[PDB]
Amino acid sequence: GTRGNQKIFRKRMERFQEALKEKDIDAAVIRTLSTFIYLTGTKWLRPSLFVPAEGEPTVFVVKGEAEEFKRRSWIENVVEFQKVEDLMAGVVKLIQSSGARRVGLEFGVERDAYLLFFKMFQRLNPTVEVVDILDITMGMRMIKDEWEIENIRKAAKIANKGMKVAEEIIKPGLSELEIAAEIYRELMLNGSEDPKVYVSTTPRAHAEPFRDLKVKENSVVTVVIGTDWNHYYANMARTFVVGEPNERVKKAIEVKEKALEIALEETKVGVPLNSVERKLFQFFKENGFEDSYLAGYTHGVGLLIEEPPMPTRATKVAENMVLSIIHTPLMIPEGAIKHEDTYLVKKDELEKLT
Amino acid sequence: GTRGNQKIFRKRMERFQEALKEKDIDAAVIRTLSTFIYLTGTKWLRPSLFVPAEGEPTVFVVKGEAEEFKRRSWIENVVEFQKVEDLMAGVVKLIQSSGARRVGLEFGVERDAYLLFFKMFQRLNPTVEVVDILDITMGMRMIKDEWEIENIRKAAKIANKGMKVAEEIIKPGLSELEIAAEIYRELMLNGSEDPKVYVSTTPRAHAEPFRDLKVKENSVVTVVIGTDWNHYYANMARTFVVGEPNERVKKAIEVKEKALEIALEETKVGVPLNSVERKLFQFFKENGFEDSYLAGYTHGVGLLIEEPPMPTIRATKVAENMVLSIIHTPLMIPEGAIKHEDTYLVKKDELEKLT
Ligand SMILES: [Co+2]
Ligand SMILES: [Co+2]
Ligand code: NA
C-alpha cells in the first residue's frame, strides 16, 4: 500500500540501530518480509536489507527495480543485481567495508528466513558470527503505535466483509475451496494484498481448503480469516452452524463460548499469558473436553497474522499489543470449533477491533 | 479425483530410506510441505514427518487430526500432540529410540524450513549432528513418473483458464490486485488449492500485486500464473500489450521471442543448463539489454512452482521425463518485466508444451 508518512519508518530505523549497538551488533541483515516492511516502509519481494549499527542502510533489489522501489520507500542506497551471486557478493562487500564482525539475523518463521539462504550466508561469510535478533525486531513490533492501529482497524472492517460473504454463501453441497474462493475475492477487491483464509468441514487446526471436502446438512463450517490493510493484519474466526448440529457440537460451541468469556476478562495489562492458559486447560478438563484442548489461546498480530508473543521469562500482556482470542480450536470429530477476534490491548482493557 | 495410488508413495518412502542408508544417515526430519506431500501422499499443514533409515515413518499432527490423516495417507503411525513442547519431546524420543547420530534436515526455501525451527532443533537435540538432505529429496522429484505428469497436464489446463480470464479483463484503470483477484478465484474454482498469481504494471521480478498500481494506456501488463492440481503445479506467463507500445517495448518483446527460440532448441537431453544460460546472457548483451538480463532462464516444476534443476541458485544435465518452465527470467525494461513462460515436458528429442 506504501501509504504512511515516511517519518515513522525512519525513526524505526534509528531506534533499531540503537538496539543493535546495545547488543554489540555491528550490522543486521534483514531477510524477513515483515521486518523489511517495518524498516523500509514498503513490501518488496526477495527482501534484502542491510542495516549497519552506524551509517545508512542499503536495500538490494533486482535490476530495473531501483526506481520503482525508491518511489515507495525513503531509502536511497539501492543496489541492483542480475544474479543471486551478485546479491550475496554485494552483501559481503557491505559487511567487509563496514568491518562488521557480528551480524544479526532474524531466526523467524517467514520468507526469506529459509535454511538454504542461512547455509548460503555462512559459507559466503565463513568468518562471520550470526546473532539472533528476532527478539529485537519483534520487541519493537509487539507494541503498536497509533498509525499501526489505524491500519489494523481498517483490516478488521475488511475481514468483516469477507466473513459476511462467508455467512451468506455457506450452503450444504459447496466445497471448502469454492467458499474460500469467494472470500478471497471479497478481501482482495477491498484492498487486501496478502490475505489467508481457512475453511474446514473437518477438524483441522490449520485448515487450508480442499477441493473435495463439501459442506453437509446438519454440520458446522469454521472460517478463519487473516486479511491485511497497509500490510497490517487482523484476524477473526467463526464457526457457522449449518442446519441442526448434533449434541456434541452444541456442547462444544457452548463450552467454547464460556472459555472465551474467561480468556477475555483475564487478559489484562500485567498478567502473563500462561496465567490465562492455565485456567483454560483446567476449565476444559472439568467440562469433559480435556482431550479436545489445545495450548496457545492467543498470539500477537501485526505485519504477521501470527507474531510474538506466540508459543511456537514469560512475557506479560502490555499496552498497545494486538492479540487474537481465542486462537486454539476445540477439536471434536465434527470440526474445529473456533471463535477468534482481534483485540487492541489498552490500559487494562481489551478493545474488540473485528 | 484420485489423490494418488498409495503404492506410489510407499515406494517413494522406501527409495528415500535407501538414500539415507547409502549416505550413513540414521534418520531424516521432513518439515518442507512439498516433500511431505511427496512421501505421505497428502497435504497437511505444519508438515512434521520423521523418517528413520530402517523402519516405519511417523507423522505428528494436532490432537483430533489422527483419524483424518490416516484416511488420506498410507502412513499408519500418527502421533497427536496438544502443545508444541510435546511435539518437540516426541521428535527427540524418536531420535534416541532409533539411536540416531546423524539426522537429515532439508535446507530448503519453503515452509517449514525456517530458521527458528532449525535453531530449536539443535537446541533441543544438542547431541545430534545435522546434515543437509535437500539434494536427496529433490533428486527423486526431478524425474517425474506418469501419474505426476498427468497432474501437471491437468494443472496446465487450469492455468489456461486463469490466463483466459486475465486477457479478457485487463483494461486501463484496473489495479494489479483487482486483476489478480479474478484470476485467483478462477483458479480455485477449477480445483487449485494453492495457486499464486503475479500481475505487474511496473518492472518487478516477483510481482505480487499491489492495490494502488493501475493499468495504464499504452503500457504492458505481465501475468504469471502458478496453479496446482493434486498439489502439482504448472506455470505459464504472458506479457499483454495494452494500447500502443513504444519502440522499447516492441523491441523487448521481439528480442524475448528470439531468446525463446534459443532456449527451446538448446534444451535437449544431456546438455547442462548453464550451457544454455550462457547463450541467453550474450544474446541480451548484443541487443543492448545487458542491464535488463536476468540469470535463471528455466527451472523445474512439480510439487513446487520453482524446484531443481535451476542454473541460478549443481551442473545438472537435462534428462528425459523432466518438467521445465521456459523462459522463467523476465526482460526488465522501465515499462515492465517482459515474460513469456510455458510448462514443457522434456522428451527424448523434443519439448512438449503442456500449457
Ligand atoms: Co489465530
Ligand atoms: Co517460472
Ligand atoms: Na490409510
Side-chain angles (χ1 to χ4, degrees):
Chain A
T2 284
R3 278 289 161 272
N5 188 324
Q6 288 185 348
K7 93 175 93 186
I8 175 182
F9 308 112
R10 309 181 55 119
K11 67 176 68 172
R12 290 172 181 179
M13 189 60 89
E14 165 181 359
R15 181 145 57 94
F16 176 66
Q17 289 175 299
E18 146 166 38
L20 299 182
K21 299 183 285 182
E22 310 210 349
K23 274 64 85 177
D24 293 324
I25 283 163
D26 307 318
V29 175
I30 300 293
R31 302 275 273 115
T32 71
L33 180 56
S34 61
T35 301
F36 186 92
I37 298 176
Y38 187 76
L39 298 182
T40 70
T42 178
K43 171 193 181 186
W44 206 256
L45 266 299
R46 292 327 93 181
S48 306
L49 172 62
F50 177 83
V51 178
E54 191 79 33
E56 285 159 316
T58 301
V59 174
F60 292 91
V61 299
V62 183
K63 298 279 279 280
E65 296 181 347
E67 247 292 293
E68 216 302 284
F69 177 84
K70 291 175 180 177
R71 299 192 285 263
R72 312 183 72 92
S73 177
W74 60 277
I75 295 206
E76 283 276 354
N77 300 93
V78 177
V79 178
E80 288 182 319
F81 60 96
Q82 63 178 43
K83 39 188 185 177
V84 60
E85 301 90 293
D86 295 340
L87 186 45
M88 274 305 158
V91 183
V92 312
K93 191 60 180 60
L94 277 52
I95 292 182
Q96 289 307 73
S97 295
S98 65
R101 298 284 346 131
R102 291 203 351 157
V103 169
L105 261 69
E106 277 178 302
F107 292 90
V109 280
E110 88 180 299
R111 53 175 182 180
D112 280 329
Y114 294 115
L115 264 306
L116 190 149
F117 301 149
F118 172 84
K119 171 201 183 174
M120 179 205 306
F121 185 75
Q122 292 184 321
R123 171 175 286 174
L124 278 95
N125 299 268
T127 80
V128 84
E129 155 198 335
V130 316
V131 186
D132 192 8
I133 59 175
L134 186 63
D135 61 327
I136 290 168
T137 71
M138 291 296 330
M140 317 178 51
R141 288 166 48 184
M142 305 184 36
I143 311 303
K144 272 73 181 172
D145 56 63
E146 306 183 60
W147 177 75
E148 295 182 295
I149 298 174
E150 202 194 353
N151 294 324
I152 299 176
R153 289 184 185 270
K154 292 200 190 144
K157 297 300 182 180
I158 297 176
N160 289 335
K161 290 181 178 297
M163 197 64 76
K164 157 171 173 62
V165 166
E167 172 134 55
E168 275 167 24
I169 62 170
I170 289 170
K171 265 174 311 297
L174 272 55
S175 74
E176 300 175 352
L177 188 57
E178 288 167 358
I179 301 173
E182 305 295 343
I183 302 173
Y184 267 109
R185 181 206 246 174
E186 179 73 9
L187 300 173
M188 284 167 83
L189 290 177
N190 287 128
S192 292
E193 294 161 334
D194 289 291
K196 162 175 56 175
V197 175
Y198 293 162
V199 179
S200 56
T201 60
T202 67
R204 307 197 305 276
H206 323 255
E208 290 184 5
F210 283 103
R211 65 170 197 261
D212 45 4
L213 291 207
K214 313 181 212 67
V215 175
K216 311 170 279 259
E217 69 197 348
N218 304 287
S219 66
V220 284
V221 187
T222 300
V223 177
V224 182
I225 291 180
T227 199
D228 56 304
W229 176 261
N230 280 336
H231 312 296
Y232 284 80
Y233 284 96
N235 306 307
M236 92 179 265
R238 298 293 189 269
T239 298
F240 297 97
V241 166
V242 182
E244 317 291 318
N246 54 45
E247 282 294 321
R248 166 161 55 193
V249 173
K250 265 148 66 180
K251 167 56 135 202
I253 297 176
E254 189 179 358
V255 171
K256 176 61 82 165
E257 274 179 39
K258 294 173 175 52
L260 181 68
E261 296 173 348
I262 291 167
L264 274 187
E265 212 181 344
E266 294 288 326
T267 294
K268 305 296 210 300
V269 176
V271 301
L273 300 175
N274 327 85
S275 151
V276 185
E277 189 73 43
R278 193 201 91 253
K279 316 206 184 187
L280 288 169
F281 169 46
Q282 60 81 21
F283 186 81
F284 292 125
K285 188 214 150 267
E286 321 184 309
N287 294 264
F289 281 106
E290 195 199 311
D291 273 342
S292 293
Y293 158 88
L294 287 163
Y297 84 101
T298 189
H299 59 76
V301 189
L303 291 165
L304 284 171
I305 287 179
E306 242 183 297
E307 56 187 37
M310 38 180 193
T312 306
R313 199 198 60 183
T315 304
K316 313 176 180 34
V317 177
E319 189 185 338
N320 272 349
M321 276 185 338
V322 193
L323 303 175
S324 280
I325 303 101
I326 298 181
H327 169 70
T328 37
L330 205 53
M331 306 285 300
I332 65 179
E334 285 76 20
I337 314 289
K338 275 199 66 170
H339 196 279
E340 195 173 16
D341 282 292
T342 291
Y343 298 86
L344 172 60
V345 176
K346 310 178 71 73
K347 312 210 272 178
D348 199 0
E349 56 176 353
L350 300 181
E351 195 196 328
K352 181 175 173 181
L353 305 183
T354 50
Chain B
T2 284
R3 280 289 164 171
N5 187 325
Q6 287 186 348
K7 273 177 282 187
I8 295 180
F9 309 111
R10 305 174 52 118
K11 68 175 69 172
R12 291 172 183 178
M13 188 60 89
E14 286 286 334
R15 180 50 188 80
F16 175 65
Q17 289 175 299
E18 147 165 38
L20 300 182
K21 299 183 285 81
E22 301 199 345
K23 275 175 182 180
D24 291 325
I25 283 164
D26 308 318
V29 175
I30 300 293
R31 301 274 273 114
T32 71
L33 179 56
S34 56
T35 301
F36 186 92
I37 297 176
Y38 188 76
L39 299 181
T40 71
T42 178
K43 171 193 181 187
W44 205 255
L45 268 302
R46 291 325 92 92
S48 307
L49 172 62
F50 177 83
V51 179
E54 191 80 33
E56 283 159 316
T58 301
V59 173
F60 292 92
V61 299
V62 172
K63 185 69 178 300
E65 295 181 346
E67 304 300 297
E68 209 188 338
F69 182 85
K70 292 175 180 177
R71 299 193 287 262
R72 311 181 72 93
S73 176
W74 65 277
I75 294 206
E76 289 276 354
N77 197 239
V78 177
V79 177
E80 287 182 319
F81 58 89
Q82 305 183 356
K83 38 188 184 294
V84 58
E85 303 91 71
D86 295 340
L87 197 186
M88 254 301 161
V91 182
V92 312
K93 275 151 204 47
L94 279 176
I95 292 182
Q96 284 184 256
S97 295
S98 65
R101 293 277 311 131
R102 286 200 252 158
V103 168
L105 260 178
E106 277 178 302
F107 291 76
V109 280
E110 87 179 299
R111 53 173 183 179
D112 280 329
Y114 296 117
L115 263 58
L116 190 149
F117 301 134
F118 173 83
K119 168 203 182 76
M120 297 204 53
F121 187 76
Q122 292 187 322
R123 163 178 282 189
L124 280 96
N125 299 268
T127 79
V128 172
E129 158 199 336
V130 188
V131 60
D132 191 8
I133 59 174
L134 185 62
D135 60 321
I136 289 166
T137 71
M138 297 298 332
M140 317 176 52
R141 288 164 47 184
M142 257 180 33
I143 310 303
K144 273 73 181 172
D145 56 62
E146 217 299 281
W147 176 76
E148 295 182 295
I149 299 174
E150 204 197 354
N151 295 324
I152 298 176
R153 289 184 184 270
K154 291 183 182 182
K157 298 300 181 180
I158 297 176
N160 290 335
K161 290 181 179 297
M163 198 64 78
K164 158 170 174 180
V165 166
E167 170 132 54
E168 275 167 23
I169 62 170
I170 290 169
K171 261 47 165 283
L174 274 196
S175 74
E176 300 176 351
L177 188 57
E178 288 166 358
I179 300 173
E182 305 294 343
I183 302 173
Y184 264 108
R185 181 201 157 255
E186 178 72 9
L187 300 173
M188 283 169 195
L189 291 176
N190 288 282
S192 293
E193 293 160 334
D194 286 291
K196 162 178 59 177
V197 174
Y198 294 164
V199 179
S200 56
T201 61
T202 67
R204 306 197 304 275
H206 322 255
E208 289 185 5
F210 284 104
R211 66 169 197 260
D212 45 4
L213 291 207
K214 313 275 185 57
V215 174
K216 314 167 195 53
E217 70 195 348
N218 304 287
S219 66
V220 284
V221 186
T222 300
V223 177
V224 183
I225 291 180
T227 198
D228 55 305
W229 178 261
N230 279 336
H231 311 295
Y232 283 80
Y233 284 95
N235 307 307
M236 94 179 266
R238 296 294 185 269
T239 299
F240 297 96
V241 285
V242 181
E244 177 184 4
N246 54 44
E247 280 292 323
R248 164 162 55 194
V249 173
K250 266 149 186 177
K251 261 60 201 185
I253 298 176
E254 193 185 1
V255 171
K256 176 61 81 164
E257 274 180 39
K258 295 173 175 176
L260 183 69
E261 296 173 349
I262 281 168
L264 272 287
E265 213 181 344
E266 294 287 326
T267 293
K268 308 168 77 62
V269 176
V271 65
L273 301 175
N274 263 334
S275 152
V276 185
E277 187 72 43
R278 61 170 66 173
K279 318 206 184 305
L280 284 306
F281 170 49
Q282 59 80 22
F283 185 81
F284 293 126
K285 188 215 149 268
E286 318 183 311
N287 295 84
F289 283 107
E290 195 198 310
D291 271 343
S292 293
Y293 159 86
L294 286 163
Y297 84 99
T298 189
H299 59 76
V301 52
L303 292 165
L304 283 171
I305 286 179
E306 305 182 45
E307 56 188 36
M310 329 181 194
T312 306
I313 206 52
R314 299 233 65 93
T316 304
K317 315 174 181 34
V318 176
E320 189 185 338
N321 274 340
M322 276 184 337
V323 193
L324 304 174
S325 281
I326 304 173
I327 298 181
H328 168 70
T329 37
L331 204 53
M332 307 286 300
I333 65 179
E335 284 76 20
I338 314 289
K339 276 199 66 170
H340 193 78
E341 195 173 16
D342 282 292
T343 291
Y344 298 86
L345 173 60
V346 176
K347 310 179 71 72
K348 313 209 271 179
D349 199 0
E350 57 175 353
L351 299 181
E352 195 198 328
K353 182 174 72 67
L354 305 183
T355 50

